[PDB]
């Protein structure tokens, strides 16, 4: 049912899929037959970009699997496969920590903005390592700075009480700390047995509508409140957050309705030996 909120999110994550595919080396791979996995695919933005960037290639030269833990999202990708006529693509519900795909028969695994969500991140790395063929590549990205958070911070400041609010580091570190750091990420892939691990940081500058920024912040408010507010603060003031965000958005960005944004993700790649 939280499919409607991923529809807003995918407007942003689309800006990060091309660098993921470029980083992976897929467009210059001599591995054959190409067998790709869009792991934790959400609404399938990586799969979208794969079919665009591979448009010149013989459609029989590659196949794609899309997997997500959610059945609503998988079903969305499955309807996309059918509507767009992706005959070489299939979608299935799967757990990234234990995919039940066959050992050593993928050439590339792509996992965009997902690894921080995995409760056992090492188990997901070993599984992806297992399902890759020798010489195959795992390519991932994770958020490091997402600038909607600061717009919400400013909104919360206008609330008539000094209320706690997390910094980017405190927020990003809520689950799986360290994945917002390119050096930590590289070490984790190296410790799992990937070789030729490379890590970097990539920013995108874009504009988002005030309305879209509201819809992004709304599902995250109860999470922020539960972890950084006392229960007394939650019960006295949570109902004030959304009204103040809307008020702050229009007063600050209402002339054009556009919010300039700069988000940064770490990207990383690792290879299975041989």
Task: Report the residue number, 45 or 101, with the smaller CB distance to ligand SAH.
Answer: 45
Binding site annotation covers 91?
Answer: no
Size of the site for ligand SAH (CB under 6 A): 19
Question: Any contact of residue 10 with ligand SAH (CB under 6 A)?
Answer: yes
Fill in the per-residue mask, 93 to 132: x = in contact with ligand SAH (CB under 6 A), - = not in contact.
--xxx--------------xxx--xx--------------
User: Which residues 39-58 are close enough to bind ligand SAH by CB under 6 A?
Assistant: 40-42, 45-46
The minimum distance between CB 198 and ligand SAH, in angstroms, equals 20
Residue found under tokens 């795909």: 101
The minimum distance between CB 77 and ligand SAH, in angstroms, equals 10
User: Which residues 58-77 are close enough to bind ligand SAH by CB under 6 A?
Assistant: 68-70, 73
Separation CA 270–CA 54 (nearest Å): 22
Residue number of the CB atom closest to ligand SAH: 42
Q: Which stretch binds ligand SAH (CB under 6 A): 38-46, 49-57, 128-136, 234-242?
A: 38-46
Separation CA 192–CA 245 (nearest Å): 42
CB distance 171 to 164 below 8 Å: no
Binding site annotation covers 13?
Answer: yes
Question: Any contact of residue 202 with ligand SAH (CB under 6 A)?
Answer: no
Task: Report the residue number, 11 or 237, with the smaller CB distance to ligand SAH.
Answer: 11
Task: Report the residue number, 117 or 173, with the smaller CB distance to ligand SAH.
Answer: 117
Separation CA 266–CA 153 (nearest Å): 23
The minimum distance between CB 215 and ligand SAH, in angstroms, equals 15
Task: Report the residue number, 26 or 156, with the smaller CB distance to ligand SAH.
Answer: 26
The minimum distance between CB 153 and ligand SAH, in angstroms, equals 22
Q: Which stretch binds ligand SAH (CB under 6 A): 36-44, 100-108, 162-170, 234-242?
A: 36-44
Question: Any contact of residue 13 with ligand SAH (CB under 6 A)?
Answer: yes
* Full DSSP string of the chain: -THHHHHHHHHHHGGGHHHHHHHHTGGG---SSEEEEEET-TTTHHHHHHHHHTTTS-GGGEEEEEEES-HHHHHHHHHHHHHHT-TTEEEEE-BTTB--PPTT-EEEEEEES-GGG-SSHHHHHHHHHHHEEEEEEEEEEEEEE-THHHHHHHHHHTSSS------HHHHHTSSSTTTTSHHHHHHHHHHTT-EEEEEEEEEEEEEEEHHHHHHHHHHHHHHHHHHHS-HHHHHHHHHHHHHHHHHHHHHHHTTT-EEEEEEEEEEEEEE---
Separation CA 109–CA 99 (nearest Å): 12
Binding site annotation covers 87?
Answer: no
Residues flagged as binding site for S-adenosyl-L-homocysteine = 13, 68, 95-96
Contacts with ligand SAH by CB under 6 A lie at 10, 13, 40-42, 45-46, 68-70, 73, 95-97, 112-114, 117-118
């Amino acid at each position: 049912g939280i499919l409607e909120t991923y529809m807003i999110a995918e407007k942003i994550t689309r800006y990060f899929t091309r660098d993921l595919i470029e980083l992976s080396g897929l467009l210059e791979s001599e591995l054959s037959p190409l067998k790709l996995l869009d792991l934790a695919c959400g609404t399938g933005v990586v799969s979208e970009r794969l079919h665009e960037m591979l448009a010149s290639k013989a459609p029989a030269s590659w196949e794609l699997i899309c997997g997500d833990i959610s059945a609503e999202l998988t079903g969305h990708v499955k309807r996309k496969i059918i509507e767009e006529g992706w005959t070489n693509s299939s979608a299935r519900v799967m757990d990234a920590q234990n995919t039940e795909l066959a050992t050593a028969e993928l050439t590339h695994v792509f996992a965009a903005l997902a690894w921080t969500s995995f409760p056992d991140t090492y188990a997901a790395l070993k599984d992806s390592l297992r399902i890759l063929r020798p010489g195959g590549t795992l390519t991932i990205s994770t958020w490091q700075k997402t600038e909607w958070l600061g717009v919400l911070e400013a909104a919360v400041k206008t609330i008539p009480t000094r209320l706690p609010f997390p910094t980017t580091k405190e927020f990003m570190s809520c689950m799986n700390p360290g994945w917002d750091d390119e050096n930590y990420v590289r070490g984790r892939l190296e410790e799992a047995g990937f070789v030729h691990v490379y890590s970097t940081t990539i920013s995108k500058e874009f504009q988002i509508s005030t309305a879209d920024l509201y819809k992004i912040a709304a599902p995250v408010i109860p999470i922020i409140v539960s972890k950084w507010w006392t229960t007394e603060q939650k019960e006295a003031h949570e109902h004030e957050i959304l009204p103040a965000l809307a008020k702050h958005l229009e007063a600050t960005y209402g002339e054009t309705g556009l919010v300039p944004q700069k988000w940064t993700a770490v990207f990383a790649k690792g290879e299975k030996e041989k």
